């Protein structure tokens, strides 16, 4: 029941963003002790979720793979209820979705066999999902969960879409545990950068694994891979950017009552991409992104109503 709007050969009635990655089932403590509430999250899904609330008149699509069990159907229903277009979701007969459990907060997860790890199994389906997207967004988690072949399939699809005028956006989102080794991680992340117009790295993660001395070194590294607009998040600190050789800095207004940094980066990315799609200048988009993330860290959970 998500409105997809109309189209002719040349234009679609809705601006269209596609987000590609893994959505996770999540269980978080409910009020009665020993009980947990079931919901859905996951980095790229979270960004799609914030996007659907920022621009509910637009088309926000999610591309992934899920199972055919009850939990997978619950997940599909959740996306629709969030105003997210899940029409491109692939179903993998023998598998189920990934899950994480928050304990009371500690995170445990199970995703090694998730259906989403096959999301790049069908090159045609990937290409069709991107074809008329204004922006295609993916993360280093999207890359991490795929095998060698799937990664190549995804990067080729991204590169071809980029060449037809899709704007490609990438959050490195470094999570070493999801990679076989950090050598593989850093190498593959930079392959992702090589197909992206916009990159949204977070500095402290980059500094740990790449050895970046500062946010400007981070930007330079991405710009070296051909990224046109690099926006470097850095916690409570100013956001440095680099766009076509031009550097800039955008302040991040102090937030008191920081509660939970969950989805800080995911919501930043949504606020940023929302504003870029509206045709606002990068400095303005970064300011908007920081404002949204500022509210998000003041709320509990990955999906905060703002």
Known binding positions for Mg(2+): 54
Site for a copy of itself in 58-97 (CB under 8 A): 69-71, 74, 96
Q: What DSSP string runs through 143-178?
A: HHHS-HHHHHHHHHHHHHHHHHTPEEEEE----GGG
| Residues marked as catalytic | 266
Which one among 226, 235, 251, 281 touches ligand ADP, defined by CB under 6 A?
235
CB of 197 to Cl ion, least distance (A): 28
Which one among 18, 157, 242, 290 touches ligand ADP, defined by CB under 6 A?
290
Asked if 36 interacts with a copy of itself (CB under 8 A), we say yes
Q: For a copy of itself, how many residues bind (rule: CB under 8 A)? A: 22
113/261 with CB nearer a copy of itself? 113
By CB atoms closer than 10 A (0-12, 13-18, 19+), residue 292 is buried
By CB atoms closer than 10 A (0-12, 13-18, 19+), residue 265 is buried
Q: Which does 290 bind (CB under 5 to 8 A by kind): a copy of itself, ligand ADP, Cl ion, none?
A: ligand ADP
Q: Print the binding letters for residues 14-33 with a copy of itself: x by CB under 8 A, - otherwise.
A: -----------x-x--x-x-
Site for ligand ADP in 239-258 (CB under 6 A): 239, 252, 255, 258
Residues 40, 151, 192, 164: is their CA dihedral positive or negative?
negative
* Interacting residue ranges for Cl ion, rule: CB under 5 A: 8
Helix (H, G, I), strand (E, B) or coil at 85: strand
CB of 99 to a copy of itself, least distance (A): 6
CB of 262 to ligand ADP, least distance (A): 7
Q: Do 37 and 58 touch, CB atoms closer than 8 A?
A: no
- 229, 228, 227, 251: which is closest to 239 by C-alpha? 251
Residues 258, 261, 264, 265: is their CA dihedral positive or negative?
positive
Q: How far is CA 128 from CA 18, 60, 147, 288, in A?
A: 11, 15, 21, 31
Give the Cα separation of 106 and 29 in Å (integer): 11
133/200 with CB nearer ligand ADP? 200
Q: Do 116 and 97 touch, CB atoms closer than 8 A?
A: yes
Q: Which does 34 bind (CB under 5 to 8 A by kind): Cl ion, a copy of itself, ligand ADP, none?
A: a copy of itself
90 DSSP β-pair partners: 65
The stretch among 77-85, 91-99, 264-272, 274-282 that binds ligand ADP (CB under 6 A) is: 264-272
Asked if 34 interacts with a copy of itself (CB under 8 A), we say yes
Q: Give the footprint of ligand ADP on this chain (CB under 6 A).
A: 202, 233, 235-236, 239, 252, 255, 258, 261, 264-265, 268, 290, 293-294, 297
Q: Give the footprint of a copy of itself on this chain (CB under 8 A).
A: 25, 27, 30, 32, 34-38, 69-71, 74, 96, 99, 101, 103, 106, 108, 110, 112-113
């Amino acid at each position: 029941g998500v409105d997809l709007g109309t189209e002719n050969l040349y234009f679609q009635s809705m601006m269209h963003i596609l987000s590609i990655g893994e959505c996770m089932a999540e269980l978080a403590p409910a009020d009665l002790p020993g009980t947990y509430r079931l919901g859905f999250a996951g980095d790229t899904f979270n960004t799609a979720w914030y996007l659907a609330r920022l621009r509910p008149e637009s088309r926000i699509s999610y591309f992934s793979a899920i199972g055919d069990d009850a939990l997978s159907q619950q997940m599909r229903a959740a996306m629709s209820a969030a105003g997210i277009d899940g029409g491109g979701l692939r179903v993998i007969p023998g598998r189920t979705v990934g899950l994480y459990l928050i304990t009371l907060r500690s995170f445990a997860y199970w995703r090694g066999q998730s259906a989403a790890r096959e999301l790049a199994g069908d090159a045609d389906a990937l290409a069709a999902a991107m074809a008329r997207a204004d922006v295609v967004y993916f993360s280093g988690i999207t890359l991490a969960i795929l095998d060698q072949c799937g990664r190549a399939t995804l990067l080729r699809a991204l590169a071809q879409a980029r060449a037809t005028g899709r704007t490609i956006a990438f959050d490195p989102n470094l999570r070493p545990r999801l990679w076989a080794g950090t050598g593989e991680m850093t190498e593959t992340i930079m392959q992702g950068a090589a197909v992206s117009d916009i990159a949204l790295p977070s500095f402290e993660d980059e500094a740990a694994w790449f050895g970046d001395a500062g946010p400007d070194a981070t930007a330079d590294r991405y710009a070296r891979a051909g990224v046109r607009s690099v926006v470097v998040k850095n916690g409570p600190h100013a956001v440095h950017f680099l766009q076509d050789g031009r550097r800039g800095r955008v302040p991040v207004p102090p937030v008191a009552q920081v509660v939970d940094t969950t989805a800080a980066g995911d919501s930043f990315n949504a606020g940023l991409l929302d504003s870029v799609l509206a045709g606002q200048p990068l400095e303005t988009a970064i300011a908007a992104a920081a404002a949204l993330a500022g509210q998000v860290v003041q709320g509990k959970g990955a999906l905060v109503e703002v």
